Coordinates of C-alpha atoms and ligand atoms in Angstrom, one line a residue:
Chain A
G29 CA -12.9 27.1 -16.4
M30 CA -14.1 23.4 -17.5
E31 CA -12.4 20.1 -16.3
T32 CA -10.5 18.0 -19.0
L33 CA -10.0 14.2 -19.5
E34 CA -7.8 13.4 -22.3
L35 CA -8.8 10.5 -24.2
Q36 CA -7.8 8.4 -27.2
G37 CA -8.4 11.0 -30.4
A38 CA -9.8 14.0 -28.1
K39 CA -9.6 16.2 -25.0
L40 CA -13.2 15.7 -23.4
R41 CA -14.3 18.8 -21.4
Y42 CA -16.9 18.7 -19.1
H43 CA -18.5 21.0 -16.4
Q44 CA -18.4 19.9 -12.8
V45 CA -20.1 21.0 -9.9
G46 CA -21.9 20.1 -6.7
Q47 CA -21.0 17.1 -4.3
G48 CA -22.4 13.6 -3.7
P49 CA -22.8 10.8 -6.2
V50 CA -21.7 11.4 -9.8
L51 CA -24.3 12.1 -12.2
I52 CA -23.6 12.7 -16.0
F53 CA -25.7 14.4 -18.2
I54 CA -25.1 13.7 -22.0
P55 CA -26.1 16.5 -24.4
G56 CA -28.7 16.0 -27.5
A57 CA -28.2 18.0 -30.6
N58 CA -26.9 20.7 -28.7
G59 CA -23.9 18.5 -28.0
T60 CA -22.5 20.7 -25.1
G61 CA -22.8 20.5 -21.5
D62 CA -23.7 24.2 -20.8
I63 CA -27.5 23.7 -21.5
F64 CA -27.6 21.7 -18.1
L65 CA -26.0 24.3 -15.8
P66 CA -29.2 26.2 -14.5
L67 CA -30.3 22.4 -14.1
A68 CA -27.0 21.8 -12.4
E69 CA -27.1 24.5 -9.9
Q70 CA -30.6 23.3 -8.6
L71 CA -28.9 19.8 -8.4
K72 CA -25.3 20.5 -6.9
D73 CA -26.2 20.2 -3.4
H74 CA -27.4 16.5 -4.1
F75 CA -25.1 15.4 -6.8
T76 CA -21.5 15.8 -8.3
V77 CA -23.0 17.1 -11.5
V78 CA -21.0 16.4 -14.6
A79 CA -22.3 17.8 -17.9
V80 CA -19.8 16.7 -20.9
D81 CA -19.3 18.8 -24.1
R82 CA -19.2 15.3 -26.3
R83 CA -15.7 15.2 -28.2
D84 CA -16.8 16.8 -31.5
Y85 CA -18.6 19.9 -29.9
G86 CA -17.9 22.9 -27.7
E87 CA -14.5 23.0 -25.7
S88 CA -13.8 19.3 -26.3
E89 CA -11.5 19.1 -29.2
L90 CA -10.5 16.0 -31.3
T91 CA -6.8 15.5 -31.5
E92 CA -6.6 13.2 -34.7
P93 CA -9.4 13.8 -37.5
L94 CA -12.7 12.0 -37.9
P95 CA -12.6 9.1 -39.9
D96 CA -13.8 10.1 -43.4
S97 CA -16.1 7.1 -43.2
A98 CA -17.9 9.1 -40.2
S99 CA -19.6 11.0 -43.1
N100 CA -21.5 7.9 -44.0
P101 CA -25.1 7.4 -43.0
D102 CA -24.7 3.9 -41.4
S103 CA -21.4 4.9 -39.9
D104 CA -20.9 3.3 -36.2
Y105 CA -17.7 5.3 -35.2
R106 CA -19.0 8.6 -33.3
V107 CA -21.9 7.1 -31.3
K108 CA -19.6 4.2 -30.0
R109 CA -16.7 6.7 -29.3
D110 CA -19.3 8.9 -27.6
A111 CA -20.4 6.1 -25.2
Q112 CA -16.9 5.0 -24.6
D113 CA -16.2 8.5 -23.6
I114 CA -18.9 8.4 -20.8
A115 CA -17.6 5.0 -19.5
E116 CA -14.1 6.5 -19.1
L117 CA -15.8 9.8 -17.7
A118 CA -17.5 7.9 -14.9
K119 CA -14.6 5.4 -14.4
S120 CA -12.2 8.3 -13.7
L121 CA -14.4 10.3 -11.3
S122 CA -16.2 7.2 -9.1
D123 CA -15.0 3.5 -8.3
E124 CA -18.7 2.9 -8.2
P125 CA -21.4 3.2 -10.6
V126 CA -22.7 6.5 -11.6
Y127 CA -26.2 8.0 -12.6
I128 CA -26.7 9.1 -16.1
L129 CA -29.1 11.2 -17.9
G130 CA -28.9 11.6 -21.7
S131 CA -31.3 14.0 -23.9
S132 CA -32.4 13.2 -27.5
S133 CA -29.5 12.0 -29.4
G134 CA -27.7 12.1 -26.2
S135 CA -29.8 9.7 -24.7
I136 CA -29.0 7.2 -27.6
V137 CA -25.3 7.8 -26.4
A138 CA -26.8 6.6 -23.0
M139 CA -28.3 3.4 -24.5
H140 CA -24.9 2.6 -25.8
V141 CA -23.2 3.2 -22.5
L142 CA -25.6 0.9 -20.9
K143 CA -25.1 -1.6 -23.7
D144 CA -21.4 -1.8 -23.8
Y145 CA -20.1 -0.7 -20.4
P146 CA -23.1 -1.5 -18.0
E147 CA -20.6 -1.3 -15.2
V148 CA -20.7 2.2 -14.8
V149 CA -24.6 2.4 -14.7
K150 CA -26.2 2.6 -11.5
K151 CA -29.3 4.2 -13.1
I152 CA -29.7 5.6 -16.3
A153 CA -32.6 8.3 -17.8
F154 CA -33.4 8.5 -21.3
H155 CA -35.1 12.1 -21.9
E156 CA -37.3 11.6 -25.2
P157 CA -35.0 9.4 -27.3
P158 CA -35.2 9.8 -31.0
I159 CA -34.0 6.6 -31.9
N160 CA -35.9 4.7 -34.4
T161 CA -34.1 1.3 -35.0
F162 CA -36.4 -1.0 -33.1
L163 CA -39.5 1.0 -33.9
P164 CA -42.4 -1.0 -35.7
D165 CA -42.5 2.2 -38.1
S166 CA -38.7 2.4 -38.2
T167 CA -38.4 2.5 -42.2
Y168 CA -40.5 5.2 -42.2
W169 CA -38.4 7.4 -39.6
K170 CA -35.3 6.2 -41.2
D171 CA -36.1 6.8 -44.8
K172 CA -37.4 10.4 -43.7
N173 CA -34.2 11.1 -41.6
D174 CA -32.2 10.0 -44.8
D175 CA -34.2 12.1 -47.2
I176 CA -34.4 15.3 -44.9
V177 CA -30.8 15.1 -45.0
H178 CA -30.1 14.7 -48.5
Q179 CA -32.6 17.6 -49.3
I180 CA -31.0 20.0 -46.9
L181 CA -27.2 19.4 -47.8
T182 CA -27.7 19.2 -51.6
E183 CA -31.0 21.0 -52.8
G184 CA -29.8 24.4 -51.5
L185 CA -26.3 24.0 -53.3
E186 CA -27.7 22.8 -56.6
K187 CA -29.8 25.7 -57.2
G188 CA -27.2 28.1 -55.8
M189 CA -24.6 26.9 -58.4
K190 CA -27.4 27.2 -61.1
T191 CA -27.9 31.0 -60.5
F192 CA -24.4 31.7 -59.7
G193 CA -23.1 30.2 -63.3
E194 CA -25.6 32.7 -65.0
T195 CA -24.2 35.8 -62.6
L196 CA -20.8 34.8 -64.0
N197 CA -22.2 34.1 -67.4
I198 CA -20.6 30.7 -67.8
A199 CA -20.2 28.9 -71.2
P200 CA -22.7 26.1 -71.9
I201 CA -19.6 23.8 -72.5
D202 CA -18.3 24.3 -69.1
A203 CA -21.5 24.4 -67.5
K204 CA -22.5 21.2 -69.1
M205 CA -19.4 19.3 -68.0
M206 CA -19.5 20.9 -64.3
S207 CA -22.8 19.6 -63.3
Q208 CA -22.8 15.8 -64.6
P209 CA -22.7 13.7 -61.5
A210 CA -19.8 11.5 -60.8
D211 CA -20.0 7.6 -62.0
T212 CA -19.8 6.6 -58.4
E213 CA -21.7 7.2 -55.1
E214 CA -18.2 7.8 -53.6
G215 CA -17.2 10.0 -56.5
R216 CA -20.5 12.0 -56.0
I217 CA -20.0 12.9 -52.4
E218 CA -16.2 13.8 -52.4
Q219 CA -17.7 15.9 -55.2
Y220 CA -20.3 17.6 -52.8
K221 CA -17.4 17.8 -50.0
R222 CA -15.2 19.4 -52.9
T223 CA -18.0 22.2 -53.9
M224 CA -18.9 22.9 -50.4
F225 CA -15.3 23.2 -49.3
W226 CA -14.6 25.3 -52.1
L227 CA -17.8 27.5 -51.5
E228 CA -16.8 28.4 -47.8
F229 CA -12.8 28.0 -47.9
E230 CA -12.1 29.2 -51.1
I231 CA -14.0 31.5 -53.4
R232 CA -14.2 34.5 -51.2
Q233 CA -10.7 34.2 -49.8
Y234 CA -9.3 33.5 -53.2
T235 CA -10.9 36.2 -55.1
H236 CA -10.5 39.1 -52.8
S237 CA -6.7 38.2 -52.3
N238 CA -4.0 41.1 -52.1
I239 CA -2.8 41.3 -55.5
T240 CA -2.4 44.3 -57.3
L241 CA -1.6 45.3 -61.0
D242 CA 1.8 46.5 -59.8
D243 CA 3.2 43.1 -58.9
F244 CA 2.3 41.8 -62.4
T245 CA 4.3 44.7 -64.1
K246 CA 7.4 43.6 -62.1
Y247 CA 7.5 40.4 -64.2
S248 CA 5.4 41.1 -67.4
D249 CA 7.9 39.4 -69.7
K250 CA 7.0 36.0 -67.9
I251 CA 3.3 36.3 -67.8
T252 CA 0.7 35.3 -70.4
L253 CA -3.1 35.6 -69.8
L254 CA -5.2 32.7 -71.4
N255 CA -9.1 32.9 -72.5
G256 CA -11.0 30.0 -73.8
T257 CA -12.1 29.9 -76.9
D258 CA -15.4 28.4 -76.0
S259 CA -16.0 30.6 -72.5
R260 CA -16.2 33.9 -74.3
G261 CA -18.4 36.7 -72.5
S262 CA -17.5 34.8 -69.3
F263 CA -16.3 37.0 -66.1
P264 CA -13.1 35.5 -66.0
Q265 CA -12.5 36.8 -69.5
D266 CA -13.1 40.1 -68.4
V267 CA -10.7 40.0 -65.4
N268 CA -8.0 38.9 -68.3
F269 CA -9.4 41.7 -70.6
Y270 CA -8.8 44.4 -67.5
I271 CA -5.3 43.4 -66.6
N272 CA -4.1 43.1 -70.2
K273 CA -5.8 46.8 -70.8
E274 CA -3.8 48.2 -67.9
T275 CA -0.9 46.6 -68.2
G276 CA -0.1 45.3 -71.9
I277 CA 0.4 41.7 -70.9
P278 CA -0.9 39.6 -73.8
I279 CA -4.0 37.4 -73.8
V280 CA -3.3 34.3 -75.9
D281 CA -6.5 32.5 -76.9
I282 CA -6.7 28.7 -76.3
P283 CA -9.3 26.1 -77.1
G284 CA -12.0 25.0 -74.6
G285 CA -13.9 26.6 -71.9
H286 CA -12.9 27.3 -68.2
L287 CA -12.0 23.4 -68.2
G288 CA -10.5 23.6 -71.9
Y289 CA -7.2 21.5 -70.7
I290 CA -9.6 18.5 -70.2
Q291 CA -12.1 19.8 -72.8
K292 CA -9.9 19.9 -75.9
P293 CA -6.5 18.9 -74.4
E294 CA -4.8 18.4 -77.9
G295 CA -5.7 21.8 -79.0
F296 CA -4.7 23.2 -75.7
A297 CA -1.3 21.5 -75.7
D298 CA -0.4 22.9 -79.2
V299 CA -1.1 26.6 -78.1
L300 CA 1.1 26.0 -75.1
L301 CA 3.8 24.6 -77.4
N302 CA 3.8 27.7 -79.6
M303 CA 3.9 30.3 -76.8
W304 CA 6.6 28.2 -75.1
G305 CA 9.7 27.6 -77.1
Chain B
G11 CA -2.5 8.3 -55.0
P12 CA -2.2 5.0 -57.2
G13 CA 0.7 6.4 -59.3
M14 CA 1.3 9.9 -57.5
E15 CA 4.3 11.4 -55.6
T16 CA 4.7 13.1 -52.5
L17 CA 6.6 16.1 -51.3
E18 CA 6.0 16.3 -47.3
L19 CA 5.8 20.3 -46.5
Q20 CA 5.0 21.9 -43.2
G21 CA 1.4 20.8 -42.5
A22 CA 0.5 18.6 -45.3
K23 CA 1.5 15.9 -47.5
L24 CA 1.2 17.1 -51.1
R25 CA 0.6 14.6 -53.7
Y26 CA 1.3 15.4 -57.6
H27 CA 1.3 13.3 -60.8
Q28 CA 4.4 13.4 -62.7
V29 CA 4.8 12.6 -66.3
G30 CA 7.4 13.4 -69.2
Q31 CA 10.8 14.5 -69.9
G32 CA 12.1 17.9 -70.5
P33 CA 11.6 21.4 -68.3
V34 CA 9.3 21.0 -65.4
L35 CA 6.0 22.5 -66.0
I36 CA 3.8 22.4 -62.9
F37 CA -0.1 22.9 -63.3
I38 CA -2.3 24.4 -60.6
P39 CA -5.9 23.0 -60.6
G40 CA -8.9 25.2 -59.9
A41 CA -12.1 24.3 -58.1
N42 CA -11.8 20.5 -58.6
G43 CA -8.6 21.0 -56.5
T44 CA -7.0 17.8 -57.9
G45 CA -4.2 17.4 -60.6
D46 CA -5.8 14.3 -62.4
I47 CA -7.9 16.7 -64.5
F48 CA -4.8 17.8 -66.4
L49 CA -3.9 14.3 -67.2
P50 CA -5.0 14.1 -71.1
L51 CA -3.4 17.1 -71.7
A52 CA -0.1 16.1 -69.8
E53 CA 0.1 13.1 -72.2
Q54 CA 0.3 15.9 -75.3
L55 CA 3.2 17.6 -73.4
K56 CA 5.0 14.5 -72.0
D57 CA 7.5 14.6 -75.0
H58 CA 8.5 18.3 -74.4
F59 CA 7.6 19.2 -70.4
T60 CA 8.3 17.2 -67.1
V61 CA 4.7 17.9 -66.5
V62 CA 3.7 18.2 -62.9
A63 CA -0.1 18.2 -61.9
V64 CA -0.9 19.0 -58.2
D65 CA -3.7 17.7 -55.6
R66 CA -3.5 21.1 -53.7
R67 CA -3.2 20.3 -50.1
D68 CA -7.0 20.3 -49.1
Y69 CA -7.9 18.1 -51.8
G70 CA -7.8 14.6 -53.5
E71 CA -5.0 12.5 -52.4
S72 CA -3.1 15.1 -50.7
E73 CA -3.6 15.2 -46.7
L74 CA -3.0 17.8 -44.1
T75 CA -0.7 16.8 -41.2
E76 CA -2.2 19.4 -38.9
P77 CA -5.7 21.1 -38.5
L78 CA -6.6 23.7 -40.7
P79 CA -6.4 26.9 -38.8
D80 CA -9.9 28.1 -37.2
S81 CA -9.3 31.6 -38.9
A82 CA -9.7 29.7 -42.3
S83 CA -13.0 30.1 -42.4
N84 CA -13.0 34.0 -42.2
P85 CA -13.6 35.3 -45.7
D86 CA -10.7 37.9 -45.8
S87 CA -8.1 35.2 -44.4
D88 CA -4.9 35.2 -46.4
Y89 CA -4.2 31.6 -45.3
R90 CA -5.0 29.3 -47.4
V91 CA -4.0 30.9 -50.9
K92 CA -0.5 31.6 -49.3
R93 CA -0.2 28.3 -48.2
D94 CA -1.0 26.8 -51.4
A95 CA 1.4 29.4 -53.4
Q96 CA 4.3 28.4 -51.2
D97 CA 3.6 24.8 -51.6
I98 CA 4.0 25.5 -55.1
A99 CA 7.5 27.3 -54.5
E100 CA 8.7 24.4 -52.7
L101 CA 7.6 21.6 -55.3
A102 CA 9.5 23.6 -57.9
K103 CA 12.4 24.1 -55.8
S104 CA 12.2 20.3 -54.8
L105 CA 12.2 19.6 -58.6
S106 CA 14.2 21.7 -60.2
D107 CA 17.2 24.2 -59.6
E108 CA 16.2 26.2 -62.8
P109 CA 13.0 28.4 -62.5
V110 CA 10.2 26.2 -63.9
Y111 CA 7.2 26.4 -65.8
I112 CA 3.6 27.3 -64.2
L113 CA 0.0 27.1 -65.6
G114 CA -2.9 27.7 -63.2
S115 CA -6.5 27.6 -64.0
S116 CA -9.4 29.5 -62.3
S117 CA -8.6 29.9 -58.5
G118 CA -5.6 28.1 -59.5
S119 CA -4.3 30.7 -61.5
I120 CA -4.6 32.9 -58.4
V121 CA -2.5 30.5 -56.3
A122 CA -0.2 31.2 -59.1
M123 CA -0.5 34.9 -58.9
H124 CA 0.7 34.6 -55.3
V125 CA 3.6 32.3 -56.5
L126 CA 4.7 35.2 -58.8
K127 CA 4.3 37.8 -56.1
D128 CA 6.1 36.1 -53.3
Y129 CA 8.3 33.6 -55.3
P130 CA 9.2 34.9 -58.5
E131 CA 12.6 33.1 -58.2
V132 CA 11.1 29.9 -59.1
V133 CA 8.9 31.2 -62.3
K134 CA 10.4 30.7 -65.7
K135 CA 7.2 31.5 -67.5
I136 CA 3.8 31.6 -65.9
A137 CA 0.3 31.4 -67.6
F138 CA -3.0 32.5 -65.8
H139 CA -6.0 30.6 -67.3
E140 CA -9.1 32.5 -67.0
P141 CA -8.5 34.0 -63.3
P142 CA -11.7 35.0 -61.3
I143 CA -9.8 37.3 -59.0
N144 CA -11.5 40.9 -58.5
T145 CA -9.3 42.7 -55.9
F146 CA -8.2 45.2 -58.2
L147 CA -11.0 45.5 -60.4
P148 CA -12.8 48.8 -60.5
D149 CA -15.8 46.8 -60.4
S150 CA -14.3 44.8 -57.2
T151 CA -17.2 45.8 -55.0
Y152 CA -19.8 44.6 -57.3
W153 CA -18.2 40.8 -57.7
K154 CA -17.0 40.9 -54.1
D155 CA -20.6 41.5 -52.9
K156 CA -21.8 38.6 -55.4
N157 CA -19.5 36.2 -54.0
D158 CA -20.3 37.0 -50.4
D159 CA -24.1 36.9 -51.3
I160 CA -24.3 33.8 -53.2
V161 CA -22.1 31.8 -50.7
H162 CA -24.2 33.0 -47.8
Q163 CA -27.2 31.9 -49.4
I164 CA -26.3 28.4 -50.5
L165 CA -25.0 27.7 -47.2
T166 CA -28.2 28.9 -45.2
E167 CA -31.3 28.9 -47.5
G168 CA -31.7 25.1 -47.7
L169 CA -31.2 24.7 -44.1
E170 CA -33.7 27.2 -43.0
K171 CA -36.8 25.8 -44.9
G172 CA -35.5 22.1 -44.3
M173 CA -35.3 22.2 -40.5
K174 CA -39.0 24.1 -40.5
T175 CA -40.7 21.2 -42.3
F176 CA -38.7 18.6 -40.6
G177 CA -39.9 19.8 -37.0
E178 CA -43.5 19.6 -38.9
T179 CA -42.6 15.9 -39.5
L180 CA -41.4 15.3 -36.0
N181 CA -44.4 17.3 -34.5
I182 CA -42.1 19.1 -32.5
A183 CA -43.7 20.8 -29.4
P184 CA -44.2 24.8 -29.4
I185 CA -41.9 25.3 -26.6
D186 CA -39.2 23.8 -28.3
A187 CA -40.0 25.1 -31.6
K188 CA -40.2 28.7 -30.3
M189 CA -36.9 28.0 -28.7
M190 CA -35.2 26.7 -31.6
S191 CA -36.6 29.6 -33.6
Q192 CA -34.4 31.9 -31.7
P193 CA -30.8 33.1 -33.3
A194 CA -28.1 33.6 -31.1
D195 CA -27.1 37.1 -29.9
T196 CA -24.1 37.7 -31.9
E197 CA -22.8 36.8 -35.2
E198 CA -20.3 34.3 -33.7
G199 CA -23.2 32.6 -32.1
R200 CA -25.2 32.5 -35.3
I201 CA -22.4 30.8 -37.2
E202 CA -21.7 28.6 -34.3
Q203 CA -25.4 27.5 -34.2
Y204 CA -25.1 27.1 -38.0
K205 CA -22.0 24.7 -38.0
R206 CA -23.4 22.7 -34.9
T207 CA -26.5 22.3 -36.9
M208 CA -24.9 21.3 -40.3
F209 CA -22.6 18.8 -38.2
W210 CA -25.5 17.1 -36.2
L211 CA -27.3 16.5 -39.9
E212 CA -24.5 15.4 -41.5
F213 CA -22.5 13.5 -39.0
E214 CA -25.0 12.5 -36.0
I215 CA -28.9 12.2 -37.0
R216 CA -28.8 9.3 -39.3
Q217 CA -25.9 7.6 -37.3
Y218 CA -27.2 7.7 -34.1
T219 CA -31.2 7.5 -34.8
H220 CA -30.3 4.1 -36.7
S221 CA -27.7 2.6 -34.3
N222 CA -27.7 -0.8 -33.2
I223 CA -29.9 -0.8 -30.4
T224 CA -32.8 -3.4 -29.5
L225 CA -35.2 -3.7 -26.9
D226 CA -33.4 -6.9 -25.7
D227 CA -30.7 -4.4 -24.5
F228 CA -33.0 -2.4 -22.2
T229 CA -34.6 -5.7 -20.8
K230 CA -31.4 -6.9 -19.3
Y231 CA -31.2 -3.6 -17.1
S232 CA -35.0 -2.5 -16.6
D233 CA -34.3 -2.1 -12.9
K234 CA -31.9 0.9 -13.8
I235 CA -34.0 2.7 -16.7
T236 CA -36.1 5.4 -16.3
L237 CA -37.8 7.1 -19.2
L238 CA -38.5 10.9 -19.3
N239 CA -41.5 12.8 -21.1
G240 CA -41.7 16.6 -21.3
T241 CA -45.1 17.5 -19.9
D242 CA -44.8 20.2 -22.9
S243 CA -43.7 18.1 -25.9
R244 CA -47.2 16.0 -25.9
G245 CA -47.6 14.2 -29.4
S246 CA -43.9 14.8 -30.4
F247 CA -42.1 11.9 -32.1
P248 CA -39.6 11.3 -29.1
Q249 CA -42.8 10.6 -26.8
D250 CA -43.9 8.0 -29.0
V251 CA -40.6 6.4 -29.0
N252 CA -40.8 6.2 -25.1
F253 CA -44.5 5.1 -25.3
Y254 CA -43.5 2.1 -27.5
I255 CA -40.4 1.2 -25.1
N256 CA -43.0 1.3 -21.9
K257 CA -45.4 -0.8 -23.9
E258 CA -43.2 -3.5 -25.0
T259 CA -40.7 -3.6 -22.0
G260 CA -42.5 -2.5 -19.1
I261 CA -40.0 -0.1 -18.3
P262 CA -41.9 3.2 -16.9
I263 CA -42.3 7.0 -17.9
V264 CA -41.7 9.9 -15.5
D265 CA -43.2 13.1 -16.5
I266 CA -41.0 16.0 -16.5
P267 CA -41.8 19.8 -16.8
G268 CA -40.5 21.3 -20.2
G269 CA -40.1 20.0 -23.5
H270 CA -37.4 18.4 -25.6
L271 CA -35.2 21.3 -23.9
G272 CA -37.0 21.0 -20.5
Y273 CA -34.0 20.7 -18.4
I274 CA -33.2 24.5 -19.3
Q275 CA -36.8 25.8 -19.9
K276 CA -37.9 24.8 -16.5
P277 CA -34.7 23.7 -14.7
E278 CA -36.2 23.9 -11.0
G279 CA -39.3 21.5 -12.1
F280 CA -36.9 19.4 -13.9
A281 CA -34.6 19.2 -11.0
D282 CA -37.4 18.7 -8.6
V283 CA -38.7 15.6 -10.5
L284 CA -35.0 13.9 -10.8
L285 CA -34.6 14.4 -7.1
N286 CA -37.9 12.6 -6.2
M287 CA -36.6 9.8 -8.7
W288 CA -33.1 9.1 -7.5
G289 CA -32.6 11.0 -4.1
Ligands
WS8_409 B1 -13.2 28.9 -62.6 O1 -13.2 27.6 -61.9 C1 -14.2 30.2 -62.5 C2 -14.9 30.6 -63.1 C3 -16.0 31.7 -62.9 O2 -16.8 32.2 -63.8 C4 -17.1 31.5 -64.9 C5 -15.9 32.3 -61.4 C6 -14.9 31.7 -60.4 O3 -15.1 32.4 -59.3 C7 -16.2 33.1 -58.8 C8 -13.9 30.7 -60.9
WS8_410 B1 -34.1 15.6 -29.9 O1 -33.1 16.7 -29.8 C1 -34.8 15.2 -30.9 C2 -36.3 15.3 -31.0 C3 -36.8 14.7 -32.3 O2 -38.0 15.0 -32.3 C4 -38.9 16.1 -31.9 C5 -36.1 14.1 -33.4 C6 -34.7 13.9 -33.0 O3 -33.9 13.4 -34.1 C7 -34.6 12.5 -35.1 C8 -34.0 14.5 -31.9

């Protein structure tokens, strides 16, 4: 039901209703044009109302991925790309400059449109802009946005793994190693994205996978289970126990913890050479 | 990676370390997802195995060449573990005509279980180091409920309280706060509302509110610019932003019914204002 304007790296989807001069609404944190539709039906007799889903939201869809660096606080890409999106939208719909209204961060997009592509702006309206760069109290509001984001992303995650570990009864040796941050601010944020991906896309899907004891017994001569000598009492040690109890597959003990192949690689290797040839 | 190999498979580019001579031994990483963690171990076995340590396709130096399917966020989707499992089977066949040695740790051992289930033709021997799979356990319900709970807790607890105090800092208006306190009417909407909000916090608010705009950039085009303040969002931080602009540039402010979300809270008074501005 939506219109489409295929751009570089995205199909931009937008509503279009009414008739008369083009007026483009840019959404804020909502990111989608549907929020403007009850306003649009009130305006359609006077303007060709265009309410855009910005490329990263809603019915829009990127066709190549975001640069990994878009994750970075002072990244430039998304906001310039969104502004250029609006410029191409206007140009595609109207030979003449159009009206534009942006709300909240969407009016920041509107500021970049009027900066980079003034030729498509006939009038522009900034509904309650939250930008702080030119404020005289700019560092205050920058630091605060920076701090609330750090707090929301990390603080919830750090407490959760801490209690999760004791629900699993994780050996101190692993828990020591697992929490030590990286030695690089880049190593630490790939480390956050890592654990965050793991929580959402791996642990539930993998630990409730369709594997039965039956499809272990088929190949019992090939399998060894392997328990850490530093991680006894932990949840994965019980899974191995249960498997061996019901199938007979043997449990070879091996130095280290859940991470023993990096904790005690030498002794880890010696056990593997023993079992295998 | 800086010394890594590549196997180009359906959907991704699989990067992996290779060291040593002899029988092929493939190591599958767990939660860290990358094979670099096996390298000191590999140095021990390099005289006896061709050690292959894998960056699984979503991690490290491997790269997807297709989008992850939408349904991979479902907690019951088979997709990722099957794809990893077959990523391994093709890696074996690409490296050896013989069946190979395989070791997986933690959720990497689960991947190895799916290699054995679906492609035992490639497994000479296999080892499961500390598997956390619960499906076949008689207390499987306990452990699956623990996983589902902790994950849902981590993904939401920080967000619920952080946005409450953030709005106190912004002095967000009641009409806006009552609205953004509302949950969507289905789980798919609540989840949608949640992904949107996490994306905005990570990829939008810091970038956009500190992007390169000076008041000079307004001065050129004062004739075109109108600024809009909700009559219902008084003393919220954006109004003070518009108050500063008007103070320093002379560009005027038009009051408009509703608050931060006024165009949908009061779309008839919003519309009426706009028609008098520009019609
Ligand atoms: B291995 O990364 C692992 C250990 C564990 O208990 C200590 C649980 C896991 O999944 C829930 C994974
Ligand atoms: B608008 O969506 C918006 C309002 C606000 O103060 C109430 C701050 C914002 O970002 C910092 C955005």
